[PDB]
Structure 1
Amino acid sequence: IFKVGDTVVYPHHGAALVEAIETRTIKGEQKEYLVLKVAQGDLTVRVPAENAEYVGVRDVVGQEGLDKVFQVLRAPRRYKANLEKLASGDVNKVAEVVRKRMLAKARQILVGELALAESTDDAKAETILDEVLAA
């Protein structure tokens, strides 16, 4: 998951292009700090490689995960926990949210999940999410 040139998706900040690994040491302890070039406003993040799986930043999903969010979209308190359902990290729990600002973040991060699992030409592919809106 944690190598050079990967595409590892932060569960809150979106997907980042990791460029390099740095052993920037914390008092003699060369922690495997991994860089993160999230292309939102380029808030460059150096996270440890060991704490990366602690915080749960995970690799991109596949076509089976795409079909999983598709079948969640097939069948369309509550409001507080469904915002927390975005904070789970499971891609089948993100697609339950889309089935008012919380609905805005859930739709755009699914297309970034859609157009990087399949690599199919992003935010114009939000229109592709509008096709499976009726499902």
Structure 2
Amino acid sequence: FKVGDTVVYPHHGAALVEAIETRTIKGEQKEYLVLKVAQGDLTVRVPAENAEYVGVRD
């Protein structure tokens, strides 16, 4: 996943990814993909390593 590419996050559906954040937790900087769905009005933030596990897909 890259910034600016629309992605499908279930069960909500379509959403637009804003950027990749490297905020540190437990002293490790994580690829925090942040993604927004207008209808849900919810900032979905997930590490990129486990993106497929949660099921987010293009």
Instruction: Output the TM-score relative to the length of structure 2.
Output: 0.86
1:53 Cα deviation after fit: 1.1
Residue-pair matches, total: 57
CA contact (8 A) 2:7 2:15 kept: yes
Moved over 2 A (4+): none
Q: In structure 2, the residue corresponding to 1:53 is in which secondary structure?
A: helix
1:24-51 alpha-carbon deviations (Å, 9 max, x no partner):
1111111100011111131111111111
Name stretches of at least 5 consecutive residues in structure 1 with no aligned partner: 59-135
Name stretches of at least 5 consecutive residues in structure 2 with no aligned partner: none
Greater relative contact order structure (CA < 8 Å, 6+ sep): 2
Q: In structure 2, the residue corresponding to 1:50 is in which secondary structure?
A: coil
Instruction: Output the TM-score relative to the length of structure 1.
Output: 0.40
RMSD: 1.0
Q: Which has the higher helix share?
A: 1
Q: Which has the higher strand share?
A: 2
CA contact (8 A) 2:10 2:55 kept: yes
Q: Distance in 2 between matches of 1:16 and 1:5?
A: 10
Identity over aligned pairs, percent: 100
Higher gyration radius (CA)? 1
Q: In structure 1, the residue corresponding to 2:40 is in which secondary structure?
A: coil
